Scaffold this active site. Structure first.
Site, PDB file in Angstrom:
ATOM      1  N   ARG A  89       0.941  -1.059   0.028  1.00 42.11           N
ATOM      2  CA  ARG A  89       0.034  -0.008   0.154  1.00 42.11           C
ATOM      3  C   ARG A  89       1.039   1.423   0.079  1.00 42.11           C
ATOM      4  NH1 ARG A  89      -5.137  -1.910   1.324  1.00 42.11           N
ATOM      5  NH2 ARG A  89      -5.086  -3.906   2.456  1.00 42.11           N
ATOM      6  N   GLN A 172     -13.028   8.302  17.718  1.00 40.61           N
ATOM      7  CA  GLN A 172     -13.385   9.571  17.482  1.00 40.61           C
ATOM      8  C   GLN A 172     -12.352  10.429  18.445  1.00 40.61           C
ATOM      9  OE1 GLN A 172     -16.927  10.327  19.468  1.00 40.61           O
ATOM     10  NE2 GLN A 172     -17.204  12.601  18.779  1.00 40.61           N
ATOM     11  N   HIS A 176      -9.706  12.833  15.842  1.00 38.54           N
ATOM     12  CA  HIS A 176      -9.834  14.303  15.986  1.00 38.54           C
ATOM     13  C   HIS A 176      -8.741  15.040  16.382  1.00 38.54           C
ATOM     14  CE1 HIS A 176     -14.480  14.624  16.041  1.00 38.54           C
ATOM     15  NE2 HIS A 176     -14.257  13.613  15.442  1.00 38.54           N
ATOM     16  N   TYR A 324      -8.123 -10.060  10.641  1.00 37.64           N
ATOM     17  CA  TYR A 324      -7.450 -10.977  10.246  1.00 37.64           C
ATOM     18  C   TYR A 324      -6.633 -12.057  11.497  1.00 37.64           C
ATOM     19  CZ  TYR A 324      -6.153  -7.547   6.535  1.00 37.64           C
ATOM     20  OH  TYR A 324      -6.483  -6.568   5.355  1.00 37.64           O
ATOM     21  N   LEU A 353     -14.080   9.636   4.523  1.00 36.24           N
ATOM     22  CA  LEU A 353     -14.348   8.117   4.502  1.00 36.24           C
ATOM     23  C   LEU A 353     -14.462   7.710   6.013  1.00 36.24           C
ATOM     24  CD1 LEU A 353     -11.625   6.215   5.527  1.00 36.24           C
ATOM     25  CD2 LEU A 353     -10.861   6.714   3.212  1.00 36.24           C
ATOM     26  N   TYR A 354     -14.109   8.597   6.959  1.00 38.83           N
ATOM     27  CA  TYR A 354     -13.871   8.318   8.479  1.00 38.83           C
ATOM     28  C   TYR A 354     -15.108   8.932   9.074  1.00 38.83           C
ATOM     29  CZ  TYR A 354     -10.440   6.090  11.477  1.00 38.83           C
ATOM     30  OH  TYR A 354      -9.634   5.426  12.318  1.00 38.83           O
ATOM     31  N   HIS A 357     -20.441   7.583  11.487  1.00 42.15           N
ATOM     32  CA  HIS A 357     -21.404   7.827  12.443  1.00 42.15           C
ATOM     33  C   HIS A 357     -22.568   6.392  12.631  1.00 42.15           C
ATOM     34  CE1 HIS A 357     -19.798  11.694  11.635  1.00 42.15           C
ATOM     35  NE2 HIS A 357     -20.158  11.911  13.070  1.00 42.15           N
ATOM     36  N   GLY A 495      -8.746   3.318   2.712  1.00 45.05           N
ATOM     37  CA  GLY A 495      -8.388   3.878   4.128  1.00 45.05           C
ATOM     38  C   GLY A 495      -7.050   3.424   4.500  1.00 45.05           C
ATOM     39  N   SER A 499      -3.700   5.709   6.318  1.00 47.05           N
ATOM     40  CA  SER A 499      -3.504   5.128   7.622  1.00 47.05           C
ATOM     41  C   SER A 499      -2.030   4.790   7.825  1.00 47.05           C
ATOM     42  CB  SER A 499      -4.229   3.988   7.961  1.00 47.05           C
ATOM     43  OG  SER A 499      -4.091   3.582   9.325  1.00 47.05           O
TER      44      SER A 499
HETATM   45  C1  COH Z   1     -14.757   7.902  14.093  1.00 50.04           C
HETATM   46  C2  COH Z   1     -16.235   7.775  14.610  1.00 50.04           C
HETATM   47  C3  COH Z   1     -16.981   8.913  14.914  1.00 50.04           C
HETATM   48  C4  COH Z   1     -17.736   9.003  16.179  1.00 50.04           C
HETATM   49  C5  COH Z   1     -17.954   7.634  17.198  1.00 50.04           C
HETATM   50  C6  COH Z   1     -18.404  10.454  16.218  1.00 50.04           C
HETATM   51  C7  COH Z   1     -19.207  10.961  17.145  1.00 50.04           C
HETATM   52  C8  COH Z   1     -20.068  11.939  17.039  1.00 50.04           C
HETATM   53  C9  COH Z   1     -20.922  12.361  18.004  1.00 50.04           C
HETATM   54  C10 COH Z   1     -21.558  11.467  19.374  1.00 50.04           C
HETATM   55  C11 COH Z   1     -20.927  11.018  20.181  1.00 50.04           C
HETATM   56  C12 COH Z   1     -21.309  13.860  17.844  1.00 50.04           C
HETATM   57  C13 COH Z   1     -22.517  14.406  18.617  1.00 50.04           C
HETATM   58  C14 COH Z   1     -20.924  14.310  16.690  1.00 50.04           C
HETATM   59  C15 COH Z   1     -20.597  15.528  15.886  1.00 50.04           C
HETATM   60  C16 COH Z   1     -19.923  15.765  14.895  1.00 50.04           C
HETATM   61  N1  COH Z   1     -18.962  14.755  14.285  1.00 50.04           N
HETATM   62 CO1  COH Z   1     -18.570  13.035  14.725  1.00 50.04          CO
HETATM   63  N2  COH Z   1     -17.836  11.138  15.005  1.00 50.04           N
HETATM   64  C17 COH Z   1     -16.988  10.363  14.522  1.00 50.04           C
HETATM   65  C18 COH Z   1     -16.380  10.703  13.342  1.00 50.04           C
HETATM   66  C19 COH Z   1     -16.259  11.813  12.581  1.00 50.04           C
HETATM   67  C20 COH Z   1     -15.169  12.458  12.008  1.00 50.04           C
HETATM   68  C21 COH Z   1     -13.856  11.880  11.647  1.00 50.04           C
HETATM   69  C22 COH Z   1     -15.519  14.020  11.647  1.00 50.04           C
HETATM   70  C23 COH Z   1     -14.683  15.133  10.922  1.00 50.04           C
HETATM   71  C24 COH Z   1     -13.948  15.884  12.044  1.00 50.04           C
HETATM   72  C25 COH Z   1     -13.847  17.201  11.383  1.00 50.04           C
HETATM   73  O1  COH Z   1     -13.811  17.415   9.989  1.00 50.04           O
HETATM   74  O2  COH Z   1     -13.490  18.161  12.141  1.00 50.04           O
HETATM   75  C26 COH Z   1     -16.894  14.044  12.338  1.00 50.04           C
HETATM   76  C27 COH Z   1     -17.592  15.318  12.166  1.00 50.04           C
HETATM   77  C28 COH Z   1     -18.505  15.867  13.220  1.00 50.04           C
HETATM   78  C29 COH Z   1     -19.110  17.089  13.289  1.00 50.04           C
HETATM   79  C30 COH Z   1     -18.891  18.197  12.195  1.00 50.04           C
HETATM   80  C31 COH Z   1     -17.630  18.831  12.388  1.00 50.04           C
HETATM   81  C32 COH Z   1     -17.404  19.182  13.624  1.00 50.04           C
HETATM   82  O3  COH Z   1     -18.219  19.984  14.555  1.00 50.04           O
HETATM   83  O4  COH Z   1     -16.453  18.731  14.247  1.00 50.04           O
HETATM   84  C33 COH Z   1     -20.145  17.198  14.238  1.00 50.04           C
HETATM   85  C34 COH Z   1     -21.070  18.283  14.604  1.00 50.04           C
HETATM   86  N3  COH Z   1     -17.215  12.939  12.908  1.00 50.04           N
HETATM   87  N4  COH Z   1     -19.683  13.243  16.376  1.00 50.04           N
HETATM   88  C1  EPA Z   2      -0.518  -0.046   9.231  1.00 53.85           C
HETATM   89  C2  EPA Z   2      -2.001  -0.006   8.497  1.00 53.85           C
HETATM   90  C3  EPA Z   2      -1.898  -0.111   7.053  1.00 53.85           C
HETATM   91  C4  EPA Z   2      -2.285  -1.445   6.674  1.00 53.85           C
HETATM   92  C5  EPA Z   2      -3.012  -2.448   7.517  1.00 53.85           C
HETATM   93  C6  EPA Z   2      -3.642  -3.431   6.861  1.00 53.85           C
HETATM   94  C7  EPA Z   2      -5.160  -3.470   6.406  1.00 53.85           C
HETATM   95  C8  EPA Z   2      -6.162  -2.486   7.091  1.00 53.85           C
HETATM   96  C9  EPA Z   2      -7.317  -3.233   7.459  1.00 53.85           C
HETATM   97  C10 EPA Z   2      -8.510  -2.483   8.039  1.00 53.85           C
HETATM   98  C11 EPA Z   2      -8.535  -1.124   8.174  1.00 53.85           C
HETATM   99  C12 EPA Z   2      -9.924  -0.650   7.885  1.00 53.85           C
HETATM  100  C13 EPA Z   2     -10.241   0.429   7.182  1.00 53.85           C
HETATM  101  C14 EPA Z   2      -9.376   1.410   7.060  1.00 53.85           C
HETATM  102  C15 EPA Z   2      -9.974   2.862   7.172  1.00 53.85           C
HETATM  103  C16 EPA Z   2      -9.620   3.621   8.545  1.00 53.85           C
HETATM  104  C17 EPA Z   2      -8.567   2.763   9.488  1.00 53.85           C
HETATM  105  C18 EPA Z   2      -7.515   3.623   9.552  1.00 53.85           C
HETATM  106  C19 EPA Z   2      -7.158   3.963  11.225  1.00 53.85           C
HETATM  107  C20 EPA Z   2      -6.402   4.977  11.328  1.00 53.85           C
HETATM  108  O1  EPA Z   2      -5.041   4.972  10.816  1.00 53.85           O
HETATM  109  O2  EPA Z   2      -7.088   6.008  11.560  1.00 53.85           O
END
Ligand code: COH
Ligand code: EPA
Ligand code: COH
Ligand SMILES: *[C@@H]1O[C@H](CO)[C@@H](O[C@@H]2O[C@H](CO)[C@@H](O[C@H]3O[C@H](CO)[C@@H](O)[C@H](O)[C@@H]3O)[C@H](O)[C@H]2NC(C)=O)[C@H](O)[C@H]1NC(C)=O
Ligand SMILES: *[C@@H]1O[C@H](CO)[C@@H](O[C@@H]2O[C@H](CO)[C@@H](O)[C@H](O)[C@H]2NC(C)=O)[C@H](O)[C@H]1NC(C)=O
Ligand SMILES: *[C@@H]1O[C@H](CO)[C@@H](O[C@H]2O[C@H](CO)[C@@H](O)[C@H](O)[C@H]2NC(C)=O)[C@H](O)[C@H]1NC(C)=O
Ligand SMILES: *[C@H]1O[C@@H](CO)[C@@H](O[C@@H]2O[C@H](CO)[C@@H](O)[C@H](O)[C@H]2NC(C)=O)[C@H](O)[C@H]1NC(C)=O
Ligand code: EPA
Ligand code: BOG
Ligand code: BOG
Ligand code: NAG
Ligand code: NAG
EC number: 1.14.99.1
Lengths: 551, 551
Positions: A89, A172, A176, A324, A353-354, A357, A495, A499
């Site tokens: 990759r 999260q 962030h 895996y 992609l991340y 939600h 992804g 990563s």
């Molecule tokens: C990884 C999983 C994940 C989770 C569990 C999660 C959980 C939650 C959650 C409840 C606990 C709430 C209320 C929100 C609320 C928000 N999230 Co996320 N978020 C997640 C991934 C993301 C990501 C990544 C972004 C982009 C961040 C940025 O652009 O600043 C995002 C963007 C946002 C935004 C718009 C931009 C910002 O204000 O930062 C809001 C609002 N959200 N999120």
């Molecule tokens: C060292 C990481 C590179 C390759 C690992 C091999 C396979 C990846 C397998 C699963 C990952 C699944 C989705 C990828 C998207 C986001 C995960 C990345 C985690 C991160 O660095 O925030």
């Protein structure tokens, strides 16, 4: 209109206009030639026939457990396969970075200006007769309609891979630090100028912020003690800007590295755990170096936690996601005789992609309580009432939701999901199929092939008309998941390279940093190479509760 | 005091304190082990026996002129030797960078903070018993004494290599894009946050400055026409800050990318030439691309000029300095199957070694006039009166001073030279011999060995007592020059690796950038690949006067 609007150049060929009505493809080092870079060189033709598809490799990695049992216990072999995993990759991420929201051609502005997210694909040109270039209708479907028909959760769909709330909040908290969109400037801009794992979400993005959060004694971070428990300090004590609604008690206005972390008690859980970890490493380093001052202790602890973070992300977090049987390994030495750039720039598309939600549940189940979104938001008293120990025990048991497969986005976050669609469009993102080709995947030939299903496929067909104009973000959430997986193929193949780059690209992974002296001796180096999500919770949470990323 | 003050760890081993009175050496990947990393492993012993000295290599490259004439004409051989030239100096530079003036240990602060010059060697600890470590007297000799005894010019000593004033001012113009000391913060701090050849000295360090300098038509930069000649615009016109003494009239306050370029008409000559080149290239690109807008034209011209600069620097500038019969080659492709980092951070010591003030003459000879320093400085009337053609013709004829060999710093810039010693000291530079060992050179065993002469060596003996506390900066100016050469061994051996990194480390040299499409097609690419100092002058100076860096 721009003659490159139709994306004629294939296989990583670069498109350039030559007059108003004409283009030329630049096929340098693509392995192809011809007008569109579609004719394979001889060597290329061979490579293409011999190369297994991502779905084949995934099968092999998620089967033959007997083989992987042997591999995982022969260190020479484990290293050799991990080396393949890492290098496969590596040809896929532009590094030094190239495009951004404002530059569809290479430029010194796009290279040098760290305020932008970079772009794995250039934006669709401003004057294209169609949103995606040339195919599809004059307008994309209403984003509310896409969201409601195929994205919003009806019934909660659990992650078949068994991801828990410890995983969901870790995701999260972790992301962030590097996804910090500068909303004042626009969706194509970031406030995370370190572009990676610098732990600014613990330490602060600026020196002003760091110095307000530091104790300036023994390398440590400021803290308070409430009911015998160590928590982050207050806004009042530190004068550190944090996002909080007016109605929050002074002592519950916690000041931490990232300004938004008071939003969610789940994020505060990790902020507190990591604060403790830092101060714990300070104690260890002081014992080892009674001669060192506060500055060296702080800086050395920071480098160690960066190391810890990367170790956990690869060996616990990515390991969990991958499904895996092979044990992934964090080992910088594996790249030392490879061609690898120790630098990173965060891609807008990585941010997109991340947006996982669907991980979020309908309620947050702690002890015997079941908190709704309204009562769980901004409410740190829940953390103090229950305590970090009960938070861990509860979150380890609560299953998170499936991401791929469609219709699993909690309605409480419907506005965020609509925004992801609208902002993708504002940033002139190319289509799903263009991104798939960019990452060496066959384009989907139908909507039913995308979803592996009939109902959502029909709704998408009637909204988009043509598979070649399907958008990336909604496609990732409706995609046919791998067998009993949380993700589909497109999530993993896009992804993984972003990563790898963000994790291995970190300076501490470079030959000149990857040395015991960098980390205060063998004891500091040991902390990194022994770190796990379990050891992190064990060392910093009262009673050392069992934890993992799966129920 | 710090246990590491004596610099015990050898062969690039890292020193770390362990307790108040004890130290430990990190020998990782040095090819050495033992308490001080002094006992070599077997492969290392074989590697040392077979490795030629820098002086042997230098002799070979500057002799057998008949053999080199052959090698220069066989493309495959030329590529092979140029590849060897590049790679032999690659393990020498920390990339990603490590120490700076405030950090003698690796830290995230030192890595991430672009406001610092980086450091090839860590600073001597604040509490060392001796300025250089443990050796020498409690005080270094008075800088005024060092300056007056061995550095200041009595007779002008011409460069035996024939460097002209075209070379002196090119050096000053070129290096002042990346040596931009932030005097508000201190000598360890830079304002060149691009850390290399970004051409900010033409386009401006910030987007604000760039935008005030740009015409916003045809990709071009603003300009004025005086007597039918194209010159840079004024401060009044652009509102661009420049450093000019108050008595300089409105019309003679030229606005250019670098704020100090009004200091010297020799600098304004190059600024005007490069401004003309940019607008020339805009004209070419517009012809090739009638469909492009101002923005793409500006950006593509910038990347072309960056390429031009690198090409000229390697194939004319470094070629001249080297004295090699071998024809050096600018070819990014030579590094494509090598391990190389496309990134750069300007080293404090690179800045220090580049204080080539002996190049400057006693008098600036234009046409039949002989201007003193007082007359030349801040005087752009001299440029307007004689014209660029006469400037080029005059500077091509007028010889520069020898840098090495002692006693050639013009009295007019004595304060500058004293500041270099003083600032080396407040930045806590390690000794010359430490810098020599860091760059794989045998330490000097005596002052007579350093100078290759008796008189200056005796003077330095009385001032420093010990060869191992001899300072780097004055040593470079008093060092025994190579046979008929401007420089001695330390200058070349320290300078060259920093140079390679700044030139080849540029993003345009990376495989994703080094393609015809990056530069607007085959025509833009050919401009980079055929650029020279003679073509730069020929294309942009009335009458196309002959030029070079010699005679
Ligand atoms: C990884 C999983 C994940 C989770 C569990 C999660 C959980 C939650 C959650 C409840 C606990 C709430 C209320 C929100 C609320 C928000 N999230 Co996320 N978020 C997640 C991934 C993301 C990501 C990544 C972004 C982009 C961040 C940025 O652009 O600043 C995002 C963007 C946002 C935004 C718009 C931009 C910002 O204000 O930062 C809001 C609002 N959200 N999120
Ligand atoms: C060292 C990481 C590179 C390759 C690992 C091999 C396979 C990846 C397998 C699963 C990952 C699944 C989705 C990828 C998207 C986001 C995960 C990345 C985690 C991160 O660095 O925030
Ligand atoms: C490359 C050769 C070269 C030349 C030909 C040259 C020619 C001239 C020249 C006549 C044209 C004048 C009046 C000056 C005057 C100065 N030079 Co130069 N300098 C040169 C290399 C440098 C460099 C490199 C610096 C450090 C600049 C920085 O860090 O900002 C420098 C520093 C200075 C300073 C700052 C003083 C300090 O604190 O270090 C002054 C003033 N000088 N120089
Ligand atoms: C990185 O890219 C950013 C976006 O291009 C850029 O921000 C932009 O900066 C310019 C100039 O500083 C601002 O334009 C200005 O134009 C005039 C001044 O004459 C004023 O009328 C405007 O209000 C404004 O100041 C843009 O507003 C600004 N764009 C934004 C914030 O989106 C950054 O400067 C670049 N970063 C670096 C370090 O160069
Ligand atoms: C990079 O390092 C420098 C040196 O410490 C920082 O400059 C200091 O910033 C602090 C906090 O804002 C000021 O109080 C000091 O006066 C500054 N010291 C100086 C001017 O020498 C600088 O802020 C750092 N850059 C970044 C991006 O954090
Ligand atoms: C490594 O280097 C250190 C310091 O350079 C050596 O320490 C001693 O060196 C001499 C040999 O014993 C002693 O006479 C000195 O007292 C002491 N040096 C200093 C500055 O205190 C040590 O011998 C070296 N170790 C090895 C294995 O060669
Ligand atoms: C590669 O480029 C594309 C350009 O998109 C292709 O041109 C077009 O192909 C369409 C489908 O075959 C035609 O309907 C369309 O008329 C055509 N446009 C042309 C020829 O100007 C090129 O044919 C193709 N080139 C090669 C050499 O394969
Ligand atoms: C950002 C810095 C990047 C590039 C600087 C480029 C050129 C600087 C020029 C010379 C560096 C100083 C001393 C070297 C002297 C002569 C070089 C001849 C030997 C050789 O390198 O082949
Ligand atoms: C709770 C999320 C749905 C809110 C209103 C539904 C928006 C219309 O969406 C429809 O939903 C139906 C039920 O899932 C499906 O049968 C249809 O295929 C879909 O188009
Ligand atoms: C003419 C060659 C001088 C020989 C070098 C040693 C003498 C230099 O000595 C210095 O010269 C400076 C020049 O103005 C003066 O400013 C100082 O007062 C003087 O001490
Ligand atoms: C906050 O949490 C407490 C329990 O800690 C709960 O009883 C209360 O209802 C919540 N407050 C809000 C405003 O939702
Ligand atoms: C500036 O140069 C002019 C020649 O154009 C000269 O006559 C004048 O003396 C110089 N100015 C000063 C004050 O040195």
């Amino acid at each position: 209109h721009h003659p490159c609007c139709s994306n004629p150049c294939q296989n990583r060929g670069e498109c350039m206009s030559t007059g108003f009505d004409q283009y030329k493809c630049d096929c340098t080092r693509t392995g192809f030639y011809g007008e569109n870079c579609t004719t394979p060189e001889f060597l290329t033709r061979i490579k293409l026939l011999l190369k297994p598809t991502p779905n084949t490799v995934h099968y092999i990695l998620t089967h033959f457990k007997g083989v992987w049992n042997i591999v995982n216990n022969i260190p020479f072999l484990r290293s050799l396969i991990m080396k393949y995993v890492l290098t496969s990759r590596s040809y896929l991420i532009d590094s030094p970075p190239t495009y951004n929201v404002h530059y569809g051609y290479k430029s010194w502005e796009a290279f040098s200006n760290l305020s932008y997210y970079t772009r794995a694909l250039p934006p669709v040109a401003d004057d294209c007769p169609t949103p995606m270039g040339v195919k599809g209708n004059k307008e994309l479907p209403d984003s509310k309609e896409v969201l409601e028909k195929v994205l919003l959760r009806r019934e909660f769909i659990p992650d078949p891979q068994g991801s828990n709330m410890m995983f969901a909040f870790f995701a999260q908290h972790f992301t962030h630090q590097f996804f910090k969109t500068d909303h004042k400037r626009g969706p194509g801009f970031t406030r995370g100028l370190g572009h990676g794992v610098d732990l600014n979400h613990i330490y602060g993005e600026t020196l002003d912020r760091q110095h307000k959060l530091r104790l300036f004694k023994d390398g440590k971070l400021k803290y308070q003690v409430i009911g015998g428990e160590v928590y982050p300090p207050t806004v009042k004590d530190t004068q550190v800007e944090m996002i909080y609604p007016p109605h929050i008690p002074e002592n519950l206005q916690f000041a931490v590295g990232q300004e938004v972390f008071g939003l969610v008690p789940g994020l505060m859980m990790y902020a507190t755990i990591w604060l403790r970890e830092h101060n714990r490493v300070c104690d260890i380093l002081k014992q080892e170096h009674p001669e060192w001052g506060d500055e060296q202790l702080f800086q050395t602890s920071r480098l160690i936690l960066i190391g810890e973070t990367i170790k956990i992300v690869i060996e616990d977090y990515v390991q969990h996601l991958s499904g895996y049987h092979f044990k992934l390994k964090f080992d910088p030495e594996l790249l030392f005789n490879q061609q690898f750039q120790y630098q990173n720039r965060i891609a807008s598309e990585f941010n997109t992609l991340y947006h996982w939600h669907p991980l979020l549940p309908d309620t947050f189940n702690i002890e015997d309580q079941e908190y709704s979104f309204k009562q769980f938001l901004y409410n740190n008293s829940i953390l103090l009432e229950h305590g970090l120990t009960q938070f861990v025990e509860s979150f380890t048991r609560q299953i998170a939701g499936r991401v791929a497969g469609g219709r699993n986005v909690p309605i409480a976050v419907q506005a965020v999901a609509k925004a992801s669609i609208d902002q993708s469009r504002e940033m002139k993102y190319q289509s799903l199929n263009e991104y798939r080709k960019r990452f060496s995947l066959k384009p989907y030939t139908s909507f039913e092939e995308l979803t592996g299903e009939k109902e959502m496929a029909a709704e998408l067909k009637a909204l988009y008309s043509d598979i070649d104009v399907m958008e990336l973000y909604p496609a990732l959430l409706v995609e046919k998941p791998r067998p009993d997986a949380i993700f589909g193929e497109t999530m993993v193949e896009l992804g993984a390279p972003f990563s790898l780059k963000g994790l291995m690209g970190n300076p501490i992974c470079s030959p000149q940093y990857w040395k015991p002296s960098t980390f205060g001796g063998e004891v500091g180096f040991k902390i990194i190479n022994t770190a796990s999500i379990q050891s992190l919770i064990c060392n910093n949470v009262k009673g050392c509760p069992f934890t993992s990323f799966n129920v």
